[PDB]
Amino acid sequence: GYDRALSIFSPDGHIFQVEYALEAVKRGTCAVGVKGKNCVVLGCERRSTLKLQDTRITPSKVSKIDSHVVLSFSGLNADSRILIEKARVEAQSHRLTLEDPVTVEYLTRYVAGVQQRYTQSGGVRPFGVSTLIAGFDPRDDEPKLYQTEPSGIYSSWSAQTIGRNSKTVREFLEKNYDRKEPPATVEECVKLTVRSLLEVVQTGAKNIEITVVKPDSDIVALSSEEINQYVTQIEQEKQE
Amino acid sequence: TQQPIVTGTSVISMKYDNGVIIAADNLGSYGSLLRFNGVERLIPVGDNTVVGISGDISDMQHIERLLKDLVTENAYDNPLADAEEALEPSYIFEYLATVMYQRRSKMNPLWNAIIVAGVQSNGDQFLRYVNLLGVTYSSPTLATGFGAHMANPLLRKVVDRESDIPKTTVQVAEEAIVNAMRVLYYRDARSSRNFSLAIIDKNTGLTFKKNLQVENMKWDFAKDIKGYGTQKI
Amino acid sequence: NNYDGDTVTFSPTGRLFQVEYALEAIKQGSVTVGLRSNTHAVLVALKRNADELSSYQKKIIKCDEHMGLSLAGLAPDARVLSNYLRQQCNYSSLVFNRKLAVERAGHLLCDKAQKNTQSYGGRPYGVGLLIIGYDKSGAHLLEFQPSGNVTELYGTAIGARSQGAKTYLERTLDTFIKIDGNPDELIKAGVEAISQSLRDESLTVDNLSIAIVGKDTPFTIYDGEAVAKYI
Amino acid sequence: GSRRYDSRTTIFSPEGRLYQVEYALESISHAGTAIGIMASDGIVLAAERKVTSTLLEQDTSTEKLYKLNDKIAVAVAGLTADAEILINTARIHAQNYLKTYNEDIPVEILVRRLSDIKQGYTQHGGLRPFGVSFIYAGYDDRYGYQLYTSNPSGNYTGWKAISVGANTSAAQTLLQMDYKDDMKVDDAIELALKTLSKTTDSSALTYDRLEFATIRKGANDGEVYQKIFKPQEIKDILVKTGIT
Amino acid sequence: MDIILGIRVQDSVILASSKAVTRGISVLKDSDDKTRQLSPHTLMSFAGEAGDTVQFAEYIQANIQLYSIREDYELSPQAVSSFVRQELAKSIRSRRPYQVNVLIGGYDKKKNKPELYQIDYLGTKVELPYGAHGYSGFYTFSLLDHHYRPDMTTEEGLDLLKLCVQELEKRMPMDFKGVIVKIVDKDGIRQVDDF
Amino acid sequence: QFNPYGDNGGTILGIAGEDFAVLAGDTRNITDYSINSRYEPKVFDCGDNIVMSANGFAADGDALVKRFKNSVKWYHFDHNDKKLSINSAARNIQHLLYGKRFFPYYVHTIIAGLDEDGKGAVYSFDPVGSYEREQCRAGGAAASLIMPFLDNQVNFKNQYEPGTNGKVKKPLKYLSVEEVIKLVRDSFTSATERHIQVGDGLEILIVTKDGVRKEFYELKRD
Amino acid sequence: TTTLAFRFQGGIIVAVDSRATAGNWVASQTVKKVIEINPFLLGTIAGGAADCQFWETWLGSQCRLHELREKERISVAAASKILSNLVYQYKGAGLSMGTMICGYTRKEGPTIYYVDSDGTRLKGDIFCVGSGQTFAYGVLDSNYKWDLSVEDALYLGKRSILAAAHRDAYSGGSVNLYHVTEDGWIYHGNHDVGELFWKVKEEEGSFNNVIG
Amino acid sequence: DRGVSTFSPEGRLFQVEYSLEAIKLGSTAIGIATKEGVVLGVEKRATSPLLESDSIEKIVEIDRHIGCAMSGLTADARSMIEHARTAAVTHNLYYDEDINVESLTQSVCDLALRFGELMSRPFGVALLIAGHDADDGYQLFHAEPSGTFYRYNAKAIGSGSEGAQAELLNEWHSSLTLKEAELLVLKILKQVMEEKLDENNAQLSCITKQDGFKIYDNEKTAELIKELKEKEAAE
C-alpha cells in the first residue's frame, strides 16, 4: 500500500498540506449559515459562468444527511461527496444502535474526525473542504449551526460563512447580527441570509440557493421566484 | 487429533542418596506385533540429564531432535556452555513441559509420557514427569504406563517418602529397578527382556548401561500346573 | 551531507550518519555511571529536570529481579528496549525456568538495534543503556550503544561529560573491583565517580538516583530520602 | 529508499490546486471535441475523431462513443485506454444495480459512482489520475433525458448542452447562442454538427472524421432506443443539414 | 414469532401480525409489533428465529432509509423486495444464515397499485394477492381461495381478515394473543387500533 | 479421539478470619486409581500477600497460577510497584478465566489474603470466571463433603440459641487462627476417610499482615 | 435462578433471589444478581453465572464510555441494545444469559428491557426471568395493579421471589430488593428466606401446604 | 524531501521538534497542583465574535478522577483523549479500581512516537493531565508529542507559556489553597492573554478527591474574576 506521509510539519510549525487545503476552500463558491430564533437558514452561491446548465439534475449544494440535519460546503466538490456519504452512513448506524437520530453536534464531531484522520494518515491528502452543518436535535427546538474545516477543528456559530469572499460577508454578519435578539421569524432569517450573499454574489437570479430548516424534520428548499422576491424587496429598500 | 502407531511401554525411575536411576526397555511395539527390538528410549542430554520417553516413537524421535537442537542452541554465544551456563535438568524439563501443554492446547498432542531424570548443578536430585496432556508431577519414584501400576508399588517399599532418600544407596536402588523390570516382563504383554538403564550420580556422573537382560526368572513351577480346575494329567 | 537522509545509506568513507546522529543524542543526555565488584553491581544516575517546578526525569529501569539498566538519551526508546528485555527475561523464566544471562541480554539488544540500522523506513534507537545484573557467573556490567555494539566492562559511564567519570574509574579499577560483600562502599565509589562529571551543580536529595544488584540482593532502586546517606 | 523517485501525485499546490488533475485537464484539452445536446424528446452525442488516416478502418471502429447499457451512453475525451478501464467498470456497476433491484440504474447513480472512482485516484493510492472526461447521455423514468459530464477531478455536473475536449470555449459560446429549451432532436442534431463544423481544427468536416449517436423515444410506444450512427448514416445526415 | 398474514385488495395492502412472544412455557409479551416501516409507502412484517428477526428487519430498514436519503427518492415495493430477496439469498449460504421469513406490503405511487410480496428465509420471492408464513397458510390460503375477490375495498379486506383470525383462533394449538393490523395505501401506512 | 482434559483429584479449602486468612489443600496428585505423587503442592504464594490454588486438572491449574503470578509481576512494572489488592486480583483472574470461555481451564480456583481494610478475605472462582467473596469456601473433589460442615461450624448455620424456642440464631463471630486450623485439620481428616482421591498430606498457607506462613500435616496414605 | 421487575405508578420494583447451582449441588446462597450499572441503571442476571457477570460488568464500562463521550447518561434503550447486539454476535456459541435492564431517564421515564442470549430484546411493564420465573409470575400477575403503593409494590416483588424460592428447587437463599424512581435506584435490603418464610407465613396466614 | 523519522545532526527528531513549534502557536493553558486539589485553566481564543464560545472544548474529562487541558492543534487531541478514556475505563474493568494518573499519562505518551513510514506524523498538541489517586495524591503532568512527560507543581503551555511559567515560578508554594490557586490561574491568564479576560473567553476547572473532576460554570468563574480584580485593587 501507498504509505507516504504527505501531511507533515515544516520548520515553522505548520502543516502545509492542511493549509493548502484551506486555499482550495477559499477558492470554492461562497456558503453562508444564519440561525434565527426558531430556524436555521443555509445560503449558497452558484457561479454564473456556467450557462446551459440543467438545474434539475445538477448536484445541489445543500445535502440532507438525515431528515433533520443538513450539510452545505465550500471547496472541492468531489471531496465533499465522500464526507457526505460517510456522514449519511453514520447517521443510519447511530439510529440502529442508539435507537435515536444523531445530534447536530455528534454528526459534526464525526465529520470533523474524518477530516482530521486524513491529516495524519499515510498515503492520503487532507479534504479540500469546509462544511456548515445545521439542524435540530431530536425532540428539541433550539437551532444548531456548526462549522468544520480540513484540519479537523469544529465549533458552533450564531452565524457563519465560508468560501470565496467569505471575509466580506463575515464582516457584514458581524455588525448586522445581534446576539441578544436573533431573527425572530423565518422571513427575517432568510432576508438577512440573502442580504449577506448580495454583498458578494453579483446578481440575485439563479446564483443564490436558499434552504430553510425548521424543527421536527421540517426542511424545504426555496424556488427561484421565492428567492427573487427577497432580492426585489431588498434592492428597493436599499435605494434610500 | 492423533492415534499412536509404533509405541514404547513403561519407563521407570527413582531417587537415591547421591542421584537418580532411570530405566526403559528397548522395544518398539506395533499394536500386538513386537515390531522393533533395537529401540533406545533413554536419551541423554549433556552429562547430567536423561530423558526417558514412552508412547509414540515417531513423536519420541521428534523430541530427540528438539533436545539435540536445544544443546546446539545453548552453546551459541555461550563461553560457559560446558560449565555454569550448561543445560540443567530443570531447564530441559520445563522446556518439554511447555511444548507438551502447547501441543495439547492446539488439539495436536505429542502422544508421550516423559520422565526427566537428572542431577542439578548444586547436587540436588531432579526427577519429574510430564505427558501428552501437559500434566506434571514429581515424586521419589516415578513410572509410566504399566510401570505406574506395578513398579511404583515395589519402588515405594524402598523409598516411601522424602526422608528415605538419604538412607537408600545406589546398590539397593539399582537392585529394585532391575527387579521391577523383571516383574514388568512377567506381566506386561508389550514389554521385552532387553532394556537400558541409566544412573546419574552427583559424584561419579552419568553411567549409561546398554543391552541389559532380565535374568534370575522363576518359571519352574509352571510344570506342576495342569488344566484349569479338575484335570489331573 | 548527501548520505545522511536515512539509515540505509553508506557514506563514501563507509559511515552510517543516521546511526552517528543517534549516538549524538546520547552525548546530550544526562550523565549515568556503572561499576561492579565480584559480589555486587551498581548503577548511579544523575537525573535531569525541566525547571524547579518540574520533577526529575527517571533514569533507571528494572528488567527482572536480577537485572536492570540506566538510560541516557531518548527516554521513550529506553522504554521500548527495557520492555523488550523484560519480555526476554520473562520468556527465559516461563519456558526454561532459567534466569536470563546478562551476556545473552546484551546479545538480544544488539540484534534488535541492528535490524533498525539496515532497513528502509525505520530509524536507529536514540538511546544508550548501561545494563547491570547478577547471574550464574557472578556480577556483570554491559554498555549498549544504538549502533548495536554491546560491551562487557568492569566500569563505565555514558552521557554528557561522561569522560570525567570514565577516567576516574580507569584509575580506581584496582580498588573498587575488590569491594566484595560491601554494598555501601561500592555505591560510595560510584557516587564519587559520577561527581567527576559535575559542573556548577552538585548532588542533591531529589537529583541523585542509585540502583544495586548482587549475590543476596535483588535489583532495587533508591530515590529521594533513601539516597541522602551518600551525599 | 524509493521515496527519492515518488512524484507525489495526490498533493495540493500552495494555491490549493491538485497538480495532476490540472495537468490531466490540459491533456484532455488537446483531445478531439465531443458535444452533447439534450432536447425535449431525445439526446444527441457528436464527436470528432482525432486526425484520421485514409487507411483507417472506419466502419468497424470505436474511439469516442461507447454504450454503457440500453438506456445510457458516453462520449469520451482523452486517453482511450483509460476510458475503457472506466467504461467496463461502469458497465459492471449498471448490471449489479439491475441484479440487486430488478430495475435499470438511474443515470445519476451511475455517474456518481464512476466520478467517485476518479475522485479516489486524486486523494489516495499515489497513482496518476485517469486522463479522461466523459459526456454521459441517458434516460430513466425519474428525470427523463439527462446530460452529465465528469472529469479527472471526479466532479460531475448536469447540462442542457455541453462540450468537452478541444475548443470547448469556442464551442460552448456557439451552443449558448443557438440553444433553446423547446428544441427537438432533429434540431439538436443540426446544432451539434454546425458547432463541430466551426470549432474543428480540420479544413472541412467529413463523415469519416465523426462519430454520432442519438437517444430518442422514437421506438414504438413509451420506450427508449439507442442509435449509434453508421458511416453511411453520418454521410447522409451531413448532406441533409447542408455541410457537404 | 408465528402468525403473519397479508392481503392485497383493490387500493391497499393489509398486513396482520400476531402479538405473542413466547419462550418455553411462558408468554413473555402479548403486545409485540412484528413489523418495520422500510419507507413511507412500504411495510415489512417478519417471523422466524428469535433475535434474527428483528436484527434482519432493522438492518433492511437501515439500508432502505440510507437509500432514501442518498437519492431523495422512495424505492418501489418491487425494488425493495428484490433487495431483500438478494440479502436472504446471500444469507442462506453463509456460516450462520438469517432464519427469517418476511412479507413486504407496499403501495407503488408511480403505478398507483398495491403490491404484496412473500419471501422466505431461503430467498424465495413471490408476488401474491394474499400471503402467509408458517402454519397460518395451511388454514388461510384455502379460506382466501374461497372468499377473496380482486376488486374488494379496504373495509371488505378487513372483514376478510377477521374471518382468517377467527379460524386461526379456533383451530391453532397455540394462543397467539390476537394480531396488530396495518394498512398500506396511497396515503402511507396506518395502524388499526381496534381489532 | 483425543481428550484434552483430565482429573488430577485433590481438594482445597479457604477460611477467612478477622485479621488473617488461610488457604489449605491436600498434597495428593492422582489419575484414575493410581497415585502420581504423595507430595505435590498446589497452594502457592503469588506475592503481594495473595495465596492461590487452582484445583482440578493440574495442567490447567499450573498454567493459570503461572499466568496470574506473571500478571502480578507486570502489574508492578506498569503501575510503579503498586500493591495488587485482593479485590483487584480477583477481577484480573476473572478475565484470565473468561478469556478461555470457549476452551476453559477445568479448575476451581480459590485465592486468599487481606482486603484493603486489613481484614481477612477469601475469593472463589468457577472454571469460566464467575467469582464471589466469602468467609468460607471448599473446592475440588471433596468439596461436597467439607462445605456443609463449614456452613455449620464457620457461619453457624442451622444453630440456634438454646432455650429460645428456635427464635434467636447463634450470633456470628470471627474465629481465631487456632480455631480455624482445627476446623481445617478435622475437615481434611474427615474427607480423607470418605474420599479416595484425598489423603497423603495436608499443606496450609496462613496469611497475616506480617507475611505468609506455612504448616504441614500428615494424612492417611491409603 | 428467579428474577423479576415490574413497572408501576411509583416507578420500578426489581427483585431477585441469591442462589447459585451446579446441577443439584447448591454452590452458593449469597450471589448478587442485581448489577448496579450506575445510579439510574440496574441489570438483573439469570443463566450462566460467568456469562452474565462478565458481560454486564462489561456493559457498565460501555455505558461509562458513553457519558464521557456524549456528556449525558445513556438511555435504557441504548444500554439494553449494546448488550443485545453483543450477545447476538456470539449467537450459537453457547452463551446463557437472561437479563433485564431497568432504569429511569428524562426522555423515556421508567423503562424495563428484557434481553436474552439468543438475541431477543423486548420492552415491557412486567417480566420474570429464570428457572423459577413461572412461580413468580403466578403470584405477581394475580396481585398486580398499576395503582399499587411503593410499600405494597415492594412487598409483592419480595413475596413473588419468596414464592419461587419455595417451589423452585434451583432458586433460594435470600431476596434482594430495589426500587427505581426518578431520582435513581434505592436499595431495600437483603432478606434471608430462612427467616422471611416463617415471618410471611405467620403474618400473612399463607403457605398452608407447609407443616407449621 | 526527507524521512519522517530522521535525526538531525544535533541528535533530535526533526518532526518532533517542528511539532513543538506548532504548540507554541496554540492558545495558553495553565495548571496548578495543590494539596486541596489541582486546577486547570485555558484561554478559549475565539477567532470571531459570532463563534459561540461555549462550544470551545479545550478542557476535557478522561475519568472522574482525571482531567485534561490542551494546547496546539486541538483536533489532534481527540484520538489522544479517546485512547485515555478507553485506557482508564479498561483498567477499571480489568482491576476493579481507579487507574494511577502516571500510568494513564504513560499510556497516552506511548502513542506519541508511534509514527513513521502507525500514523504519518507526530501529534501537534501538548496536554496537561491533572488527576488524583490514593498513592501519589494530587498530580499534574505535561505530556508532549516527543513521548516524554514531566510531573509539575505548576505548568503553563501555549503562546504565553514562557512568560506565565516565570510568573508561576515566583507565585507557587507548597501551602497554596484551592481558592488561591483558582485566582492565580485567572491572574496569570489575564496577563498573557491578548483580549481582555472574562467568563466567556476563559474557562476554569478542577479535580478534587471528594467531588472529582468538574468544569466550572460561566457564572462561577465570573465571580472568581470579580473577586480577583477587587483583591488586586485592595493593595
Ligand SMILES: *[C@@](C)(CO)[C@](*)(O)[C@H](CC(C)C)NC(=O)[C@H](Cc1ccccc1)NC(=O)[C@H](CC(C)C)NC(=O)[C@H](CCc1ccccc1)NC(=O)CN1CCOCC1
Ligand atoms: C438459578 C439459581 C439456577 O439456574 C440461576 O439461573 C443462576 C444464575 C446466577 C448464578 C447468576 N444460574 C446458575 O447458578 C448457573 C446454572 C448454570 C450452570 C451451568 C451453565 C449455565 C447455567 N450456575 C453456574 O453458572 C455455576 C456457578 C458456580 C457454581 C458459582 N457454574 C458452573 O456450573 C460452572 C461453569 C459452567 C460452565 C458454563 C459454560 C462453560 C463452561 C462451564 N461449572 C462448574 O463449576 C462445574 N463443576 C465441576 C465439578 O463441580 C461441580 C461444578
